[PDB]
Structures are given as C-alpha cells and as structure tokens.
Amino acid sequence: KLELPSGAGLTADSTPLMYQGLEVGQLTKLDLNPGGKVTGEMTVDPSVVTLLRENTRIELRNPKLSLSDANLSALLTGKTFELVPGDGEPRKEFVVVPGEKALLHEPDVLTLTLTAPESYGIDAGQPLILHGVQVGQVIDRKLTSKGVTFTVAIEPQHRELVKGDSKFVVNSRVDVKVGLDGVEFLGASASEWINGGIRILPGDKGEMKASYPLYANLEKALENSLSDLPTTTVSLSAETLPDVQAGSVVLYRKFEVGEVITVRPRANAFDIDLHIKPEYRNLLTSNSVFWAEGGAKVQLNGSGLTVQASPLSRALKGAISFDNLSGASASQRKGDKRILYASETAARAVGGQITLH
Amino acid sequence: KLELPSGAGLTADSTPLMYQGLEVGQLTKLDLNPGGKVTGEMTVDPSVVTLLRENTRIELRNPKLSLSDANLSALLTGKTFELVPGDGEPRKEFVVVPGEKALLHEPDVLTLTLTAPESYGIDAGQPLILHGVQVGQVIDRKLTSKGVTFTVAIEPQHRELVKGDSKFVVNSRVDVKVGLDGVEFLGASASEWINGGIRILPGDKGEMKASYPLYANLEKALENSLSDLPTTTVSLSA
C-alpha cells in the first residue's frame, strides 16, 4: 500500500516500480479517499519482497529533461516509482513524498533551518555547494514576518564534514566591484549562477546548533556581519570637516584599518560614528586623539611633489587617522567624548596651557 | 452548470475536472447562448458532491509550458478544469473566469488599485514580490487619461504581512549608475528582470487605503518622491 501525494501523472495499471533500471512492480490501484487523500497500492515481484524493509524508501521520479542524453523513452513513460532499499524490519506500506521533499526522508539526513532577511532569489530546489561540489539541497522556503526561513538538507556522506561550525553564503546573486587595483567578481560563477544556491564555508569544530544565519555574500560571512550597519565603536565630534559622509577608512600610523559608517550634520559640529575590527579594539585606549584630512595633499617640500598614495576612498572622501600619545587624558576629562581635530598638529596640542598677552 | 468565459480549448465530452490530479468530472455540454455567453454543464462524481460548496472555485488550467518537467501528457490534453474546494452552503452552479483573473475570486483576497504615470513595462500577469518571494500577482492593467492604473492581488497567507503601509517599486526596468566610488545596480536581478513585476517595501502599521502610487525605482520610494521634480524649498538670486 502507498500513500501518494497526488495522483497527477500516475496510471491505474501502467506506472512501474523501477529498481536498478528494471521493472519490478506495477501500480495496480489508485483511489481518492475522502479528505483529499490519494492512496494507491502496488504488486511487487516476489524476488524483491526481501528488499522492502523499514528504511526502504519509494519515491517517484519525474521525467526530467536530459540535455546530455536525448531519450524518447524517458519522455514517453512519465512518472515513475523508484525503489531504494534499506535495512530493518520488513514493512508492507509506505509513504511517497514529492520529488523536492524526498531528501528529507532518507534514513540519515541533516536538516537545518537557516534564516535570512530576504529570499535572495533562492528557489525551493536550489543545490547546496561545498568546495564546488553539491553536498545537499534546499528543501523548501517559508516566508515569515521577520524574514525568510529556509530548510536545507545534507546528504549522509557529507554529514561528517560540516562539523557544526559553518558559514552559509548565497550563490544566487552576482556582484562586481570595479577599481584601479581592486577588480573582483563575488558571489557566483556563470555556471553556478544558473544553478544558484547556498555555499558552505566549513569550520573546524562545533555543536551543530539548530538555526543559522544566511549571509548575503562572502565578505559579510568573514566579517561576521549579518546586519548591514556595523557596531559604532567610538563616537566623535567635529566642527567643519570635509572628510566623509560614510565609507572612508580609519587610518592608524597612516595605515588603513577601520571605517567611518555614520555622520550627521549639525549647525555647530558633526556627530561621527566609527567602526573598528574586534581583533583591533586593543589598539586604541583612553589616551588616543583623532584627526582628519581630506583629499590629495600634494606637498611642495623641496623638489618633491608627493601625491597621496591613498585608498581611493581618500581620493573621493577624505580619511581619518588616529594615534596614541601621553597626555590625551585631560582632553577627554573635559567634554562628554572625544573631539575630531581638523589637522594633525592641532591634535598634538596637549599639555599645560599657558596664555600670552 | 458552468458559466464559461469562452469555449476555446474546451470539448463537448472530453474536458475533465481534476481534483488532486485525479479525474472527477466531465464537461458534458457546451452551448453558445445569445448575447455572446458561452455556458456549459458538468457531471461530477457523487463522492465529490460534498466538496461543491459556496467558497468552492472551479477554474480552468492552461497547458502551461514546463521547462523542468517535459511531459507530453500535459500538452496533449489542453485545457483542464481544476477543482479547489471551500466551505459553506452547497451550491450547484459556478462561474469560471480566465487564468489571469482567477486570483481575484478566491474567498479571501486583497485587491489594490495602484496608480502610475507609465506602465513601466508591467504586463497583466507579472508576479508581485515581497522579500524575494512571490506573494501576489498583478491582475490587469487599464490605461486612463491621467496615467496607468493597475489592479493587484495579494494571496490570503501574506494578507497579514503588508499591514496597510507599504511602498510599491517597479522591478521591470534595469538601472545602472556608474562612478568611481559609487557603483550600484538598481531595479532588478537578471532572473527577476525576466519575471518583472512590483516589489513591496513593507511598513509597520497602517489602515490599508484604497489607492497607492507606484514608484519608479527604489530610491524614489525612500525619498517619497512620486513626482520627478522635487519641491523648491528656498529660492536664490546670483
């Protein structure tokens, strides 16, 4: 006896049970029980009755379009029951599921509910890719009020390899960043783009938690930034600086680590929010002063005219530097927070304050 | 008894009534009543007569082209009546609508007339997208003297999620802005461009007003600028 999903392409005496490509059984009855429950039953070969066991699954195969092998026999038959055996106690009734849901009902499977703020163009049947090779499959996609929650499955052979710590990257969208020295193509290959799906960045050791986030691209998984707006580490004030609206780099001893994420104008002085990396927050303390500069500063000193070997951020939107020093505590004792100075020498002006008349 | 839109691919004794993929009924009569009114009638299985109720809809399915499942049985049958049940008082006559208009006649549906200054290349059957997933469908497009007025529908499952305040963004046009530090692709993805349609930017709380505007791209919905020319705040002389 079978519990069919829907008797769509199934025939009362003409749908076979394939096993190793050979016809084993025959769907001999097809009913519509009340409640919208299509059930049928099947006569199998007595040689194969030993194979019908507890872990044995019967799933229907679609007449899928083969671009490599143009066969008319596959298109003429239609729907087809495929037998895959298992082990255990011999049973005599089965539950058939559709083609996309079939991976969930393997005897071993790894099912993960992974959340996302958007579908990102991921369909229900996209492949799931580790190291270029397909290791699993997305099963279904359900939209909630918070966002999109996917349900993915991992095949039993690859089950050992994810090891509970992993990152999940979308492969459904292309992304091109252009620059003079920075040229990169993120998110896909053209053959991978038409398949699409979710990429695993596998880790070393974990506990396999229930829910995972789905990162939008590759660098947001390495930054561990599921949200679009990063955490504001330090807040500044500045009267008039042409530096940046958002996206210049935080310099340290003229070196590019950090980012300016939020400014707001005010009638007197800006309010500026900075991002620095979590491995990197030890490099600044209470005794730290901030100063900003804007654009290509061509020095005239002697013969040299040195153009700023700059990130192209600074060429468009002027960067911000900082450094630690000795007596920067007294500048922070006054005022609510640090102040972003307009020049390097103005930020160095610390110490005892005299008055000339 | 059925009130058919037009007896185009329908056959006097060969058009079936599918339910759960199984043949239930059979279109047994097909007439052209005067006034240009095609009506027919159907003999259904007595097991399924309990399912024919007030909210029960009967709509015809086109033999749609399946790229994933190349089946010859779907192309050989043609038009096909699909039964979707409902609840209520048992009725014995129905009204069949075409395939695009079928979403309006669900027992619960959210129908919005949204205006636009241009069609923006939106066809009558484009999908309607929230958060990447299709939540509804455009029904029909009517051109007026002021502009284009669309009529969209939202499925009952997603009806709770729009919450009366939303923005409606076209996905039918691509837009590329180039710059040294500003590089962005607006309006579509290449898979979303061939589907096209209207994107929802959902809000928190509202009253679900009758008419909405259709913004041309994403930033004009965030700027809340339906018109091309913004308001002149201050005037100067130089």
Q: CB burial class (10 A; 0-12, 13-18, 19+) of residue A148? A: buried
A357 found inside a domain: no
- The answer to whether position B236 is within a domain reads no
H or E element that contains A314: helix A312-316
Nearest to A119 among B21, B72, B132 (CB): B132
Looking at beta carbons, which pairs linking A179-188 to residues 24 or more positions away fall under 8 Å?
Answer: A179/A312, A180/A312, A186/A217, A186/A218, A186/A219, A187/A217, A187/A218
Q: Within a 10 A sphere around the Cβ of A37, how many other Cβ atoms? A: 12
Considering only CB atoms, A36 lies closest to which of B20, B73, B130, namely B20
Q: Which of B22, B70, B192 sits opposite A121 (nearest CB)?
A: B192
Nearest to A35 by CA among B51, B53, B91, B54: B51
Do residues A61 and A1 share a domain?
A: yes
Longest dimension (CA), chain B: 86
Alpha helices by DSSP H, A143-256: 159-162, 190-195, 218-222
Report yes or no on B222 lying in a domain.
yes
Among B21, B158, B183, beta carbon nearest to A7: B21
Do the bridges between strand A166-170 and strand A198-202 make them parallel or antiparallel, or are there none, so unpaired? antiparallel
Evaluate whether A230 touches A156 at the Cβ level (below 8 Å).
no
Q: Are A237 and A248 within one domain?
A: yes
Cβ within 8 Å, pair B22-A34: no
Taking 3-state DSSP, the helix, strand and coil percentages for chain A, each rounded to the nearest 5, stand at: 10, 35, 55
Give the CA distances from residue B76 to residues A252, B10, B30, B73, B138, in Å, rounded to whole numbers and listed in that order.
72, 13, 21, 5, 29
Domain shared by B159 and B53, yes or no: no
Domain presence at residue B208: yes
What's the CA gap between A258 and A281, in Å, rounded? 10
Q: Last residue of a domain, which of B74, B107, B140? A: B107
User: Is B132 in Cβ contact with A247 (below 8 Å)?
Assistant: no
Q: Does A148 touch chain B (CB under 8 A)?
A: yes
Q: What is the CA angle B149-B153-B158, rounded to 5?
A: 140
**B133-143 vs B127-130, strand pairing mode:** antiparallel
> Does residue B28 share a domain with residue B60?
yes
Whether the CB-CB separation of A21 and A85 falls below 8 Å is answered with: no
Chain B, nearest residue to A75 by Cα: B71
Cβ–Cβ contact A316 with B under 8 A? yes
Question: Could you give the dihedral angle defined by the CA atoms of residues B70, B73, B74 and B76, in that order, rounded to the nearest 10 degrees?
Answer: 120
Taking CA atoms, B5 is separated from A143, B59, B82, B86, B145, in Å, by 34, 10, 15, 22, 29
Probe site for chain A from B52, B64, B130, B133 (most A CB atoms < 10 A): B133
- B-contacting residues in A 50-109 (Cβ below 8 Å): 62-65, 75-76, 78
What is the Cα Rg of chain A in Å?
31
**Domain identity same for A120 and A221:** yes
Q: In chain A, which residues have their Cβ closer than 8 Å to the Cβ of B20?
A: 6-7, 32, 36, 38
Q: Please name the helix (run of DSSP H) or strand (run of DSSP E) that holds residue A73, with its range, or none.
A: helix A72-77
Of A180, A213, A229, which residue sits at a domain end?
Answer: A229
Question: Residue B80 falls within a domain, yes or no?
Answer: yes
**Residue A298 burial by Cβ neighbours in a 10 Å radius (0-12, 13-18, 19+):** exposed
- Give the B window 173-232 contacts with A, CB below 8 Å: 180-181, 183, 189-192
Closest to B133 (Cβ–Cβ): which among A8, A143, A247? Answer: A143
Give a yes or no: residue B158 inside a domain.
Answer: yes
Is residue B63 helix, strand or coil? coil
Q: Is residue B166 a contact partner of residue B202, using CB atoms and an 8 Å limit? A: yes
What is the tally of structural domains in chain B?
A: 2
Tokens of A247: 């996206």
**Residue B147 placed within a domain:** yes
CB-based contact A147 B133, cutoff 8 Å: no
> Same structural domain for residues B133 and B117?
yes
- Other Cβ atoms less than 10 A from the Cβ of A112: the count is 21
Sole residue written with tokens 């059979």: B26
Contacts of A198 in chain B (CB under 8 A): none
- Chain B residue with CA closest to A194: the answer is B191
- Chain B residue numbers with beta carbons less than 8 Å from the beta carbon of A176 are 183
Contact A47, A83 (CB under 8 A): no
H/E run at residue A344: helix A344-347
Asked if residues B160 and B141 have their Cβ atoms less than 8 Å apart, the reply is no
| Shared domain check, A316 and A259 | yes
**Which residues of chain B have a CB within 8 Å of the CB of A30?**
22
CB within 8 Å of B77: residues ≥ 6 apart: B16, B63
Mutate to test the interface with B, among A119, A186, A314 (most CBs of B within 10 A): A119
For tokens 């329908």, the residue is B10
Contact B38, B4 (CB under 8 A): yes
Asked if residue B149 is part of any domain, the answer here is yes
Asked which of A183, A214, A229 is the last residue of a domain, the reply is A229
Q: Is B81 exposed, middle or buried (0-12, 13-18, 19+ CB in 10 A)?
A: buried
Contacting residues for A68 by C-beta, under 8 A, at least 6 apart: none
A348-354 contacts at long range (C-beta below 8 A, 24 or more positions apart)? A348/A289, A350/A289, A350/A325, A350/A326, A351/A327
Same domain as B184, residue B76: no
Range of the domain at A168: 108-229
**Spatial CA neighbour of A200 closest among A169, A157, A158, A224:** A169
A140 and A199 within one domain:
yes
Does residue B29 sit in the same domain as residue B77? yes
Ordered strands of the A340-341 beta sheet: A250-252, A320-324, A288-292, A340-341
Tokens of A139: 């099963």
Q: How far apart are CA B101 and CA B138, in angstroms?
A: 9
Are the CB atoms for A127 and A155 separated by under 8 Å?
A: no
Q: Identify the closest residue of chain A to B49 by CA–CA distance.
A: A34
Which residues in chain A have their CB less than 8 angstroms from residue B192's CB?
A: 121
Q: Which residues of B touch A248 (CB under 8 A)?
A: none
| Whether residue B119 is found in the same domain as residue B196 | yes
CA angle B137, B142, B148 (to 5 degrees): 90
∠A183-A188-A193 over CA atoms, to 5°?
A: 135
CB A289 within 8 A of CB A348: yes
Name every chain B residue with its beta carbon within 8 A of the beta carbon of A8.
Answer: 21
Q: Which residues in chain A are closer than 8 Å to B161, comparing Cβ atoms?
A: 143, 145
Name residue B153's beta-bridge partners: B111, B137
Task: Specify whether A97 is located in the same domain as A126.
Answer: no
Which residues in chain A have their CB less than 8 angstroms from residue B85's CB?
36
Task: Judge whether A119 is closer than 8 Å to chain B, CB to CB.
Answer: yes
| Spatial separation of the C-alpha atoms in residues A59 and A98, rounded to whole Å | 7
- Residue in A78, A121, A312 nearest the CB of B180: A312
